[PDB]
Design an enzyme around this catalytic site. Structure first.
Site, short mmCIF file in Angstrom:
data_model
loop_
_atom_site.label_atom_id
_atom_site.label_comp_id
_atom_site.label_asym_id
_atom_site.label_seq_id
_atom_site.Cartn_x
_atom_site.Cartn_y
_atom_site.Cartn_z
N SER A 33 -14.21 -7.33 84.51
CA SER A 33 -15.59 -7.72 84.73
C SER A 33 -16.65 -6.99 83.90
O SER A 33 -17.83 -7.33 84.01
CB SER A 33 -15.92 -7.60 86.22
OG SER A 33 -15.67 -6.29 86.69
N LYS A 36 -19.05 -8.98 81.74
CA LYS A 36 -20.32 -9.52 82.20
C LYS A 36 -21.53 -8.88 81.51
O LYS A 36 -22.62 -9.45 81.50
CB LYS A 36 -20.41 -9.39 83.72
CG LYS A 36 -19.57 -10.45 84.43
CD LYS A 36 -19.21 -10.08 85.87
CE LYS A 36 -18.11 -11.00 86.40
NZ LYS A 36 -17.87 -10.85 87.87
N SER A 94 -21.11 -7.93 90.91
CA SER A 94 -20.18 -8.48 89.91
C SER A 94 -19.88 -9.91 90.36
O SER A 94 -18.75 -10.24 90.72
CB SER A 94 -18.88 -7.67 89.83
OG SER A 94 -18.25 -7.88 88.58
#
Length: 260
Positions: A33, A36, A94
């Site tokens: 993640s 991102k 997230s």
């Protein structure tokens, strides 16, 4: 030099660009993640950017996180959420559902599929434009599918670039944010508060960021940044043992960089 648990690490003086720490800094690893960070950077780079623009939450975005067992911001289908709110949902808990909404929104194309493909292309172009050679995205969240890797050095450069944007900086140092969205029937919904997963914001004096990362192969990662007396240290720790180990690794590297 401090000893860390993470297999990969890197830090530099954000102002001068001087490398302060390195450990397998150029070895490619899953980003999970932390990808991102790039997702946000690409959005904030769009010339047609309107932070107040509202985006309708599609069932596709909710199905997505379920099918991929991804972290989410719990966006409700039918709700109208501003691009700014999506950036918070993307960076604090997230939210992979928020990631999908942004890719769908800012990718170019006549269909959702075409648009997400276009967006991922912009993410790779952004990496290329930064002069990166060890970064590649096949998904808009690093959790999607395909090849999604970077290196402690590459990721730090990406974050440094993103930190040049004031909206990005603001979002990233926010510990909690409560979104008030518009439902499909016109009323305003007060969502459960989104808490930033970056524990350093409240445990490390002067911490300003950036972002945590996780994934099946992204285990526990962290892109961190802190400012102490006019000096800003920014860096990345990839594939750490645990959360506590992760924060300790980041803390040690930052403390080392601030002493030099």
């Amino acid at each position: 030099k401090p000893t860390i648990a993470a297999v990969g690490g890197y830090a530099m003086n954000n102002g001068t660009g001087t490398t302060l720490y390195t450990k397998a800094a150029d070895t490619r690893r899953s980003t999970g993640s932390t990808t991102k960070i790039m997702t946000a950077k690409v959005v904030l780079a769009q010339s047609n950017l309107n932070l107040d623009a509202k985006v309708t939450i599609q069932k596709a975005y909710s199905d997505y996180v379920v099918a991929n067992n991804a972290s989410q911001a719990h966006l409700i289908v039918g709700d109208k959420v501003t691009v700014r709110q999506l950036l918070y949902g993307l960076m604090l808990p997230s939210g992979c559902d928020a990631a999908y909404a942004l890719a769908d929104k800012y990718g170019s194309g006549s269909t959702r599929a075409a648009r997400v493909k276009s967006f991922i292309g912009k993410m790779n172009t952004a990496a290329t434009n930064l002069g990166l050679h060890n970064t590649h995205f096949d998904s808009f969240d690093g959790i999607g599918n395909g090849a999604n890797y970077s290196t402690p050095r590459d990721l730090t450069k990406i974050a440094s670039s993103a930190m040049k944007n004031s909206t990005f900086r603001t979002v990233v140092k926010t510990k909690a944010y409560t979104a008030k969205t518009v439902t499909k029937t016109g009323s305003i919904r007060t969502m459960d508060t989104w808490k930033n997963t970056n524990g350093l914001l409240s445990s490390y004096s002067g911490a300003i960021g950036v972002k945590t990362g996780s994934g099946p192969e992204a285990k526990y990662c962290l892109v961190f940044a802190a400012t102490r007396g006019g000096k800003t240290v920014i860096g990345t720790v990839l594939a750490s043992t645990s959360i506590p180990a992760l924060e300790s690794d980041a803390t040690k590297i930052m403390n080392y960089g601030f002493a030099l």
